[PDB]
Amino acid sequence: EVDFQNVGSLYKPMFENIYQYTPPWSYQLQQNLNADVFSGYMTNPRPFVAGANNTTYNLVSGWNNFIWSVPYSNVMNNAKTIEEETKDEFPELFAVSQILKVTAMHRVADVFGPIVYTKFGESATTSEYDSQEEAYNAFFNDLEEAIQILSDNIDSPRFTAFDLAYGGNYTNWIKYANSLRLRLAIRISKVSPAKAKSEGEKSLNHSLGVIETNPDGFFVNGTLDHPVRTINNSWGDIRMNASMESILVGYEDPRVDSYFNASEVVEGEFKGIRNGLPLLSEYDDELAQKADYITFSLLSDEVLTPRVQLMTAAEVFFLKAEAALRGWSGAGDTRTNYEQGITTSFQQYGLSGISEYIANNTRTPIDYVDPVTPANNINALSTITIEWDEAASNEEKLERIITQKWIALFPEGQEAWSEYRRTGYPKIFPVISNQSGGVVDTDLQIRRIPFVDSELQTNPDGVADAITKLGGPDNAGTRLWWDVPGGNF
């Protein structure tokens, strides 16, 4: 009984460092200045390093080390310890640890490709990477295994005292492991369609199925302040993105006021910034530029509570929409899931007007205008309408699905950044300034992050081998294994 309580104490570091709560300067580097901006969700008002940074594709490797260091320092060590102490003795403990582990580590595989996963811990001299496919094969094995163990112990209440997501209810942990597996299956759907359909159907036809109610969403019901509260409100260092303004305002989406605040730069209107701005000529340094852009829309308080969002029920309905579009057994009806996806997102924020919104076929994303620097203006790239069109092509149908999922995933930039790179949707604005020297394409946009400095330093051979598992050079232009060019079908 004492062994249990000792192990149970290792879960909170895992909960708090998937999407890192503290210190917010470390969250800023883990995610905010890569995925949160690359997704088209947010934009830093300040052109850090005189405008030569991640957002203009001149990558700051000291920042990007933290995408790797946070999960490997705080999550993978705890998971390995839990596995070693409980896999035989307390399988339910191992099971929930594996689920949290795949949660943290598929993000990493979705940034770097090859990651250290099945071989983590094996030596202090070297560390051997899995290829991304192998990492994904391990993800599916791990969820199925942990889904089986929890089903065998579904009524045990012994996790209650350590559960920041579900208060010890293994029913929810199974429905979330199913939903997570469905997400990864959707991700490998273009590159490995038989495996994707197989894995997708395993979760769609499980007796307990996937998340479908808002309380069953996966959240960390934390105590610490939301990391983005410091960045948004204390630092003024992140604001609404122009792509969010194009799509949310054009649709007259009521979530815009759940997600953002009316701006100061244009009173009573929501205003985003183009990501990828250089240090412009009108400004003598980055602080004078930030001064004119800090006045755009803040993120709103409702999305920056201590409760951190990892998987909405809305998302799962859109994963079901694409599953059905692709013909996976047990996915249900494509239109019905799409409409319910939007419904579940409104309900999440207690918003009315759903019937009018899902029937609207005249509203489109608006052109983006920058009142400070009108050279930044750009016609809306996304032209899709809301109401389901059963006669649209498979690309347009997928676009409608992925575009509403993107609204619904906010503010979790990482999942939306992966989905954008996988599908090309929604059509977020490209960068204004591409300082990659051609290593990254402006219209295709950034594809990945190169293996991190700490690994180059202390794991050189492991990195050299990991590069042979990439489908291109070790830089930000190389498509990840699930990122396949051409159609989505």
Ligand X SMILES: CC(=O)N[C@@H]1[C@@H](O)[C@H](O[C@@H]2O[C@H](CO)[C@@H](O[C@@H]3O[C@H](CO)[C@@H](O)[C@H](O)[C@H]3NC(C)=O)[C@H](O)[C@H]2NC(C)=O)[C@@H](CO)O[C@H]1O
Binding site for ligand X (CB under 6 A): 23, 25, 28, 48, 235, 237
Residues written for the chain = 489
Q: 237 or 483, CB closer to ligand X?
A: 237
Q: 23 or 472, CB closer to ligand X?
A: 23
Q: How many CB atoms lie within 10 A of CB 234?
A: 10
Cis peptide before 23 (omega within 30 of 0): yes
Q: 32 or 263, CB closer to ligand X?
A: 32
Q: 26 or 364, CB closer to ligand X?
A: 26
DSSP string, 44-65: -SS-TGGG-SGGGT---HHHHH
Min dist. Cβ of residue 103 to ligand X (A): 25
Q: Please identify the residue of the shown chain whose CB is closest to the bound ligand X.
A: 25
Pick the closest to residue 126 from 452, 450, 457, 461 (CA basis).
461
Q: What is the rounded CA–CA span in Å between residue 373 and residue 104?
A: 39
The DSSP bridge partners found for residue 308 are 220
Q: Which two tokens stand for residue 302?
A: 């409702």
- Whether the CB-CB separation of 116 and 461 falls below 8 Å is answered with no
Min dist. Cβ of residue 31 to ligand X (A): 13
Min dist. Cβ of residue 11 to ligand X (A): 25
Min dist. Cβ of residue 19 to ligand X (A): 18
Q: 235 or 349, CB closer to ligand X?
A: 235
Q: 48 or 270, CB closer to ligand X?
A: 48
Min dist. Cβ of residue 454 to ligand X (A): 12
Min dist. Cβ of residue 264 to ligand X (A): 19
User: How far, in Å, are 43, 265, 275 from residue 298 at the CA level?
Assistant: 10, 11, 15
Alpha helices by DSSP H, 18-131: 24-27, 35-38, 61-74, 76-86, 91-112
- Whether the CB-CB separation of 31 and 69 falls below 8 Å is answered with no
Helix, strand, or coil here: 82?
Answer: helix
- Whether the CB-CB separation of 236 and 243 falls below 8 Å is answered with no
- Whether the CB-CB separation of 426 and 445 falls below 8 Å is answered with no
Helix, strand, or coil here: 272?
Answer: coil
Min dist. Cβ of residue 417 to ligand X (A): 18
Min dist. Cβ of residue 281 to ligand X (A): 22
DSSP 8-state code for residue 219? E
Q: 60 or 154, CB closer to ligand X?
A: 60
- Name the phi and psi angles at 302, rounded to 5: -60, -25
Q: 161 or 287, CB closer to ligand X?
A: 287
Q: How many CB atoms lie within 10 A of CB 149?
A: 21
Q: 54 or 300, CB closer to ligand X?
A: 54
Q: 118 or 454, CB closer to ligand X?
A: 454
Min dist. Cβ of residue 230 to ligand X (A): 7
User: How far, in Å, are 26, 154, 217, 227, 323 from residue 20 at the CA level?
Assistant: 7, 29, 19, 7, 31
Min dist. Cβ of residue 164 to ligand X (A): 24
Helix, strand, or coil here: 372?
Answer: coil
Helix, strand, or coil here: 456?
Answer: helix
